[PDB]
Amino acid sequence: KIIIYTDGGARGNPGPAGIGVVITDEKGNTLHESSAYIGETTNNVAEYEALIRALEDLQMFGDKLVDMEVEVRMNSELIVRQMQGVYKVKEPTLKEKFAKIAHIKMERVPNLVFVHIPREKNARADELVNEAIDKALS
Amino acid sequence: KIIIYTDGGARGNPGPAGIGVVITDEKGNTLHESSAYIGETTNNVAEYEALIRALEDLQMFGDKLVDMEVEVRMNSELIVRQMQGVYKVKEPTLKEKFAKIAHIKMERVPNLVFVHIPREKNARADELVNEAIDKALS
RNA sequence: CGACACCUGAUUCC
DNA sequence: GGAATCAGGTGTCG
């Protein structure tokens, strides 16, 4: 079972923005981390970009092997519900990210499950987002 | 001329609710302020109650002296239009509130007029609504 | 279908 | 103390 942790932030909303990804196995071993600066964006876009990247990163694990679940956890109710089909996606740019993600699910990741989590459970990803932002602004 | 500002809110609709009243002269003098927690009610009931309270306060300006105009300014199309004869009043509880008001007009305040206004221009009355609710919940 | 109002959840921050 | 980015719905009218 793969668990992914995703985070994003944008300073000034919109503003200088970053993404963080943590990938672990069931036991909580960290398989991979990613951190990146993504220019100036909205908060919501940053969350989506983090997810996309994480999904992207999932390839590093071969692109032959699969069928083992993935659970994505993020501190964002909006994107998680939207992914769950619970909440609509209306904003156009967000609609674009959703399409990208949908495509990826279809192509390479059929087993994707999403869970909202509170801020506390996701410090490492948030650490990663900030590491990227600070460095870029420096 | 008397200018009255009226506001209500209910948190959760229905939920904890409050009323705000500001009374002024033509010269922007603030004659009186009223504020109260009213329990849990609908958003619309809260608006009417503020109006009722405002009309009540109007006596503190003596119960002998009149035929000087009154304008009620409030941020509710529903209530303003209903008062104006533009909208029917259907819901049972609202009807009663309307009736209470028509009466006070009948007894005491014949020169009564109603104006709908935007959210931005009603800040003080709205401050009072929230002040009263916050205090009650505290 | 629309007006106005009441909010409510989550996030991003300043 | 504040605002912006994005969703959910109710209370009452037309």
Q: Main β-sheet of chain A, in a few words? A: 5 strands, mixed
Order of helices and strands of chain A: EEEHEHHEH
CATH superfamily of chain A: Ribonuclease H-like superfamily/Ribonuclease H
Q: Distance between termini of chain A?
A: 38 Å
Number of domains of chain A: 1
Structural class of chain A: alpha/beta
The CATH class of chain A is identified as Alpha Beta
- The CATH topology assignment of chain A is Nucleotidyltransferase, domain 5
Oligomer: homodimer
Number of helices of chain A: 4
Q: How many extended strands of chain A?
A: 5
| Second-tier CATH architecture of chain A | 2-Layer Sandwich
Shape of chain A: globular
Output the radius of gyration of chain A: 14 Å
- Into which percentage range does the β-strand content of chain A fall? 25-35%
Q: Identify the strand order in the major beta sheet of chain A.
A: 3-2-1-4-5
Which percent range fits the helix content of chain A? 25-40%
Keywords (chains A, B): Hydrolase
Organism (chains A, B): uncultured organism
Protein name (chains A, B): Ribonuclease H
Pfam family, one (chains A, B): RVT_3
Structure summarized in a few sentences:
Two copies of one chain form a homodimer. The first copy, chain A, is α/β, with parallel strands linked by helices and 138 residues long.
